[PDB]
RNA sequence: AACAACGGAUCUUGGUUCU
RNA sequence: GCGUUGGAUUGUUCACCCACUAAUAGGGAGUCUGGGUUUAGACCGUCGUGAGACAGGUUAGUUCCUACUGAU
RNA sequence: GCCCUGAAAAGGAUGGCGCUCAAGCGUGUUACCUAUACUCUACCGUCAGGGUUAUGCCCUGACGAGUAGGCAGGCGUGGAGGUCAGUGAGAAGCCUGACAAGGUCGGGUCGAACGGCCUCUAGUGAAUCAGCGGGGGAAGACCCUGUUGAGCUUGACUCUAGGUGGGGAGUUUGGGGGCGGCACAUCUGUUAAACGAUAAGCAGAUGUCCUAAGGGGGGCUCAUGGAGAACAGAAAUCUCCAGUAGAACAAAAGGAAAAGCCCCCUUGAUUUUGAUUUUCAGUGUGAAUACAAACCAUGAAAGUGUGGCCUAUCGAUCCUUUAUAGAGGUGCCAGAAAAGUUACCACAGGGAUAACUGGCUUGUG
RNA sequence: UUCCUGCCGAAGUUUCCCUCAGGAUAGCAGAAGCUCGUAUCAGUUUUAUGAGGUAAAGCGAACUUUAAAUAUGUAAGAAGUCCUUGUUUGAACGUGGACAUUUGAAUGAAGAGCUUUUAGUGGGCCAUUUUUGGUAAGC
């Protein structure tokens, strides 16, 4: 059901549409199409940019920007959707940090995991993989 | 026919050395590029996946 | 339970087939 | 235990405004009226080579058996 | 071990009454109820073991539930052959007191033919009257299945000297995207080129880290001749010279303090995106290819690479030399079935329910 | 959409499936069937072994011998074995015959194996005994 059908027309006949009812991040790069085109709807209330990202160390929370999703297992056509679905690899601006590689070239991004879950909850939580 | 015929169309273009690929509604208007697209207005598989 | 209007089933020169 | 009133939108009323009072409490058990839930007939645009149906939408609409109250 | 807080609301659940040294709870012992269970006795049917000058009878023991289904036998009923030298002026029929399909007799009616048995056959089995209207007359709604029928458009299949040739007709319109992966020390059948050495593959007990590449780093030089070296000799071992390097430099070619051997490490199918494509919410790439600049190994350093190769099912006898067999190859054919539509559609049902898993909800991520 | 008595007596599992659909198919039980009434069958116990080696004997606080039941298949004889070699000091297919039924542990007692085929039943409802993957909890 995760993929809701809402049915379309006056005559609730051919419905043909699916509707995302997970977190999904796509950014400045949405640019909706025509209606007619809507196969997969991903709601903007259910659109997140920021996720909490945080690592064993000095325990600091900032909220940072997502980058972009990588790898999301079972089925990575989620991937290519951008749902958040608990359990992806995700990039995060982690500029806020300030880390450094070795050879001086400072680190402003790296890939986080989702531990909690944003479907049943209002905010999403990562962990660096560092 | 004789032109009218999808056979001779086929026939002529040589898509019959790969009808293999013969999609359902192979004609001049709306090739398969199309039918597939039109055929999306007609996802709960309910498979369980190890996401690993 | 028995008596009385009612009713029409079972036990009727009819049909079928055959030369 | 007794009360919980009255106006307002519709360019949807999945709700907000303020007259007066001491307050104008929250629900279920559905049960006359209006949107609408359905085939009426049509239109604008979408989509297609076309029948055809819609991302919208407008018009037309029709749906004594038992129990209680009085009496012989 | 108990009781109390430990959450529930829009005639229920110890069944109801009720109960408090319980008639509540844990535990030890006495008397009793009872099921179609258990033991015995008799009745109805089956089997088996035996007797009986017999498909009949007798003695003994166990069995008996039940849907679909099968098996072995009886009653009634339409008609007929035979038989009872049958029944009746009171026969057939109806209803009713008596002695498992069913049969018989007395009694209230009756007026014209009707039975018993062995067989054949088949159209045979208190109580009412006057009013509002909570519940149960439009019965079909409707998610979908029939391929049952058509309503239609077309470069859908089939037809209508050469050509247009649904303008016309018959028909359908099934039930599916990634995958292949190993290299050396070995011996065996083919290959074997036939005085031979024994190579350039097929498949095999065989492993092994070379992480399916050996990349780097540090060292060694080698087939074969002589002196030789207990067994050991012409091939086992141990030292001096050289193959211009018949080692492997995969190799084909005018040709190294290594590119051959030995000791350590070891990912690589890593990341963004500057030329090419392709969608299905055209998605700042979601991606391989092209390349960019980092990352890594390694070393003391200069340095070098490491980051992929490649490919549509299936035919193999749909190809052949073959008229009783062995296969060399889709760059040689042709497709699995010939497209949709119908809230103009008509009919029959698999069919969610008002809102109850395992009490299913509550104020604090 | 048809009278009666008695007996037997089930199925919901299994293979082909490019597949909901559609097909039989092996199995469940009564039968013509005669070959053995067997020293023949068993949802079973036991004797010897491989494993649950669950740790509590360890004699090796080094380590692997190895102690309980935790339920498994196999041999548990009737021509099986043997005297004898018919045939190419050592190998095997061994005519002929013998031990003939305490004949090879105990327990249940004759319906066991048919080459073959008959109508129905097609992947059913629940709980427990194992552990695998769970995640609020269901599963």
């Known amino acids: ?130 | 026919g004789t032109g009218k015929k999808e056979k001779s169309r086929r026939i002529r273009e040589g898509d019959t050395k790969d009808g293999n690929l013969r999609v359902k509604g192979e004609n001049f208007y709306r090739d398969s590029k199309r039918v597939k697209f039109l055929n999306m207005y007609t996802f709960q598989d309910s498979t369980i996946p190890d996401a690993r």
């Open chain 1, 1 to 130: 059901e995760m993929f809701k059908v809402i049915k379309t027309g006056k005559s609730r006949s051919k419905s043909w549409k699916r509707m995302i009812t997970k977190h999904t991040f796509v950014g400045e790069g949405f640019t909706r199409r025509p209606v007619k085109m809507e196969r997969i709807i991903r709601p903007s209330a259910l659109r997140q940019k920021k996720a909490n990202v945080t690592h064993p160390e000095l325990g600091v929370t900032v909220f940072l920007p997502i980058l972009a999703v990588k790898k999301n297992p079972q089925s990575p056509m989620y991937t290519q959707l951008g749902v958040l679905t608990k359990g992806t690899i995700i990039e995060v601006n982690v500029s806020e940090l300030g880390m450094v590689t070795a050879g001086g070239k400072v680190v402003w991004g790296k890939y986080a995991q989702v531990t909690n879950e944003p479907d049943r909850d209002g905010c999403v939580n990562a962990v660096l993989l560092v």
